[model samples]
Target chain A: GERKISRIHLVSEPSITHFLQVSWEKTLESGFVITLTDGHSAWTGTVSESEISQEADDMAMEKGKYVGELRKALLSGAGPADVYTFNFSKESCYFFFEKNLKDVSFRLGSFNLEKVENPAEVIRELICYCLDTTAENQAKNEHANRMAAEAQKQVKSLQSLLKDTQIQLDDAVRANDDLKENIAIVERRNNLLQAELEELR
Target chain B: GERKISRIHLVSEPSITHFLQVSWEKTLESGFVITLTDGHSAWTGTVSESEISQEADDMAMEKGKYVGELRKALLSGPADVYTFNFSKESCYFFFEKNLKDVSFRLGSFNLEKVENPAEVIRELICYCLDTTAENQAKNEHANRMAAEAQKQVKSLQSLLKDTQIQLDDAVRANDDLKENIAIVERRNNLLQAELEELR
Candidate 1:
């Protein structure tokens, strides 16, 4: 019997996976940070335009330099708006504003959108979040002010009370001294009178 | 006889002076105070409409009722809007949102007019009153301290009286001993005299 050998064929399918090439620009006043859906995934490079990886730009260089121009406009005090752009190979491109990035804490206003699958719906979500966060920040600042004012009032009241208490203490001490003096005088008189009676005896 | 009478004629001119009438309403979540300018007077009673005197109400009762409506509206939410009404011969009422408790700034979005010089003076005066509550608390604390001191004084007085009574008793006992010794001395002196006469 001849030796029989069986052969199997393998067919490979093309990968449809996508990676995001993100570019963002913000003012010296507004700070900017971008994150992916995966928790804690963020861009980790020097916060400057030249630091963008060379290969990332080659794939998406033709996309209008709206971010670049907006950054220049910010220098002239005209535009404080931040521009962020994301390029995808086979899916949709996306961009939005990270406004007020410079302030340690600030309001993120409405975002301008492009090429999102559902622009209207996502836009509403974005605007709603921004408005609510700004309002919250405002409320926090207001409450902090109220606390400070209340503290100021309490301090002043405490100070005045301290002064008044000191006055009362002083008065009591003086009265105490007078009582001591009277008691001593009366004690001396009793001693003198006893001595006289002894001499007579 | 003719009586001499001196008569004096006096001419009087009525002077019309202007004052501010400020009415505000706030909730427990928000607090507010209002002040008026003559730079000399303020509404010193409780800071509410009911505390406004019978006379102050006569001047400012009918300007508008919008502020009263807003007070009810603020119950469901939080609002720091202070509505100020100035009732002069010409009534120009204005309302502004207090931007921040810390900032102490009135938002300029809806100021009705900007020409009143007295308005600025009155605003400063109102700001001064923010410090007043602390002083009021201080006065209360001082009163408590004073009361305590008085109590101490009373206690010390009672103690002094007790000690004085004890001292008086000791003195009386000593005096009795002196009298008894004197009697003993007198009896001995008489015996000595009798012995001498017998000799």
Candidate 2:
């Protein structure tokens, strides 16, 4: 019977998988490993195997290179499980498709999509720093908003009080004008009375 | 020849051995030269006989440490072989004799063991975070059970497909629920508008 398997694509690529390739590059001092994943059969190999056997020897070559890489990587402070990938933060583990391969070569860029000093640590630090920085910025923003609201409320209150004072000042000015006009009329009446008394004499 | 070197104890430790004591704490800082061996004399410390003198100097300190520690347990770290038994993580590498000389001065502990925070980070990162050794072991156990479940499902898949339409009725019901939710949301909005008008 023919084996039946549906071909499906996962939009989210696994970080552990990429990190594994990065680890290989960093550990083996090589940056690239050609991978073959047709779902049913998946394998990893070095470029050397491309010429010898693309499909048939792919698995063997991959395993061979992996073993060689692991030997070198372990000697250089890489642990057995860490050589592939095992993250404590996520509590996840990953492995390469092959464990042995010959003439495998790679560099940091080969594993990483971008240039980095220490890819894994750099990424970890960057993510942590961003999270920290974002939280700090949010706090600052909230504080600023609170201060701004407080200042706005104070200014609005002062403006309302000033408007009421202006109305009072206008009323006082009208009363002063009426008092001056009444005093002028009384002085004129007194002057006329004095002139009439002199004519009678 | 079969007679294994029996118990050799450091009866009297010399002070000069303290000066020559090499610890792994110092050796690992800068990559140190080491001879590889497999539980025996595989590590000769020198690839050739001409280099034997350097090996002798290297082992001179090792020999002193062996004498001080009574040839029972040898400790090592970065610089030289130190026999202060300290481990960073689950697995620690140390060489010891079949029997310990129950009476020996506790040699100075390698500063690396107690002070080297890096070893802790390295151990945790390598053993736990970087590799996830614990989870992988646990997941493998669970995956075996899941594979069995998958096998059972395949056996009944044909019969189940005939009774239930290939299109999951459950998902269709979810779509109906979503439509009902939309209608409720609109009605709620209308009611809110009426309340606001009354206000």
Candidate 3:
């Protein structure tokens, strides 16, 4: 399925009312896309709402689990799940989790979210930052997995070589022992013959 | 719009046509995926062809640039860019580059791919391995890279120790053999002298 193109509304955010209106927009498929004016040039970056929504949903579900009974409470009615914006405090995170349309869970908390400067412009940065964090996670996980596997393979090869080397070492030790035994036998014969020769003389 | 739940065929690839069929599949949306059933546990893993297809495309388009003329050649007709499957050699990668469905480029090469085993099953394994490798790159994407380093050092040190012991054994063996030979030769000479005198 195609990812959801998140709306500015879902995050309980507003349209960017600031004067960066002349700026350009780069709409990436993920959320937190915006524009910038830099180097005397205008540029914009955007992420899909779907991605942002998912990110928020993921955040909410994680919170819902933490809040315990809150999830069970949301499944009944009221504060369903919404992504893109959230607020947190020591008491609990203000959020919900929506798995399917049928499953929704809310974390009970006051939405003192209005006073926070993140309503629109601030939240845009927040979303981008959050996305960057997750992107970092996904990318890092990917990168680490590769190195992990590579290292694993290399470690395995060495372990395999060690197995062979153990046998080789055993063989060498035994071969050395056999030579020592042969030398002992030679010594006994030489001494006995020397004794016989001496007696005859 | 939702990201296209991309069709498997669109990447110009086929449905995973192998058994391990009873095994489960993991649909991680960017593509190429499969599962390994290990130990006593029944396990399944898989990737979206979109990802595998993209990995193939990434490999191809890079080739497309290197081939130069071939990319220009493909812009016109046959061998439009398709991800998820590719082959490469010294001359050019057997591939094309696609941008926005308007631009396409082809790399001129013989499709001797059939002779090689990397068709589907092999490619699938390659994709997973590649992804796993990529995961490492990403997992370290930010700060965790610095976090996940040690432990392996301990193993390496131990391996070195074992190798050192083996070499030490070999040196001892070599010296013991030389000494035994010399001792035997000296005893033989003494016996020869006594025998001659007695005769």
Candidate 4:
């Protein structure tokens, strides 16, 4: 058995959220070659037309659209294509299949395809980008609105306090005026009393 | 010849911001009665059917809706209505009219028809009742400003009271000095007379 490349299928239908599986080996006459399968469909070393029909069940046949697009993408040289991946070299390539809508599409990749630093990472990033309106983001905006509301209420109470202070200041000014007049009266009385005392002495 | 009741119109449209005015008096066959006018319309004691038509103009006719509602209100006896004032008793009725929309309405009142306690107080107060921001730094600044002003006012009040107490003490000292002088004068007079007799 020869080592093979891996592939990932991103399904958006109700049944299979999605599936990730690696390619398989077909023990062909050329010793053995890597074969990519979609359960019902495949890209193989020989890709026996008979083997494809035999292994494919009605359940998998229904999933043929995704595999079909991936194979087409491979043939068109747009997605991941075979690149001397038969050896232990890091030149392994994988396939990516997506069928979120009524439409299906593919993009392929990899190097050694076995570990990190491989091409499937690009597909993972693509998946994350597509699902970006996450709940966490919505929760963040709502929190911002609440803070803005609190700020508004705080400003109102501040103004109300300022108004009451103005009223107090007015009352204080009046009381001060009354005090000054009382002081004037007492000082006048004291002056008169002191002069009378001096005359008597 | 006398004060009138007040009225206010809360206009919500694009025209006049709003208008406030007093109702008027209409002299009639019976004598004189109060009438409320909305630039184009009026209400009266007699509220003569003819006078209503006469004072109205093309402009007023447009405004007639407001005056019409008010007088109808008077007839229905809902809003501020007339009560006693044949003599100097505090009784006055005023009318309120509003016509910002395609619709019109009214409410009426006044007591002395003057000064604070009159029904107009009700109207003046009525005129008042009908009309019943920022980010962190400036807002907090205002908050602190208010607290500072409150503290300042309290200090001023305390200082004024302290001044009053000081003045009171000075008055008490003057009174005590006067009493001392009176005692000295009596004592001196007694000693001098005694010395005269002995000599």
lDDT of 3 at B43: 22
Of models 1 and 4, which has the larger TM-score?
A: 1
Model 3 chain B poorest 10 in a row by lDDT: B1-10
- Runs of candidate 2 with Cα error greater than 4 angstroms are A1-114, B1-199
lDDT of 3: 0.39
Off by more than 4 A, model 1: A1-123, A140-158, B1-199
Q: What RMSD, rounded to one decimal, does every model reach?
A: 26.7, 29.5, 19.1, 32.1
lDDT of 2 by residue, A1-201 (tens): 111111111123342222222223343323234322211123233433333233224345464554465444322333333223211111121222222224552221111122323333332332233334334554554555555555555455555555555554455445445544544555454455445444544
lDDT of each: 0.34, 0.33, 0.39, 0.36
Q: lDDT per residue, candidate 3, A1-201, as tens digits?
A: 111111112233233211111111332222232322111222233435454445446557443242343223221222335421222231332322233333544433222111332223332232233334444567666666666666666666666766677677777778777877878778888878877876886
> Taking chain A by itself, what TM-score does each prediction score?
0.37, 0.37, 0.42, 0.34
TM-score (0 to 1) of chain B for each candidate: 0.38, 0.21, 0.26, 0.31
Worst 10 residues of 3 chain A by lDDT: A15-24
Error of 2 at A101 (Å): 49
Write down the worst ten-residue block by lDDT for model 2 chain A. A1-10
Clashes of each: 5, 34, 57, 13
Error of 2 at A119 (Å): 1.7
What is the per-residue lDDT of model 4 for residues A1-201, given as tens digits with 9 covering 90 to 100? 323223322232222211222232542222223333222222323334344443334225533553443344332222244231122221343332322223443222221223333223322222222223222343444555555555555555655655565555555556556555655555565555555555555
lDDT of 4 at B190: 59
Candidate 3 off by > 4 Å: A1-118, B1-157, B189-193, B196-199
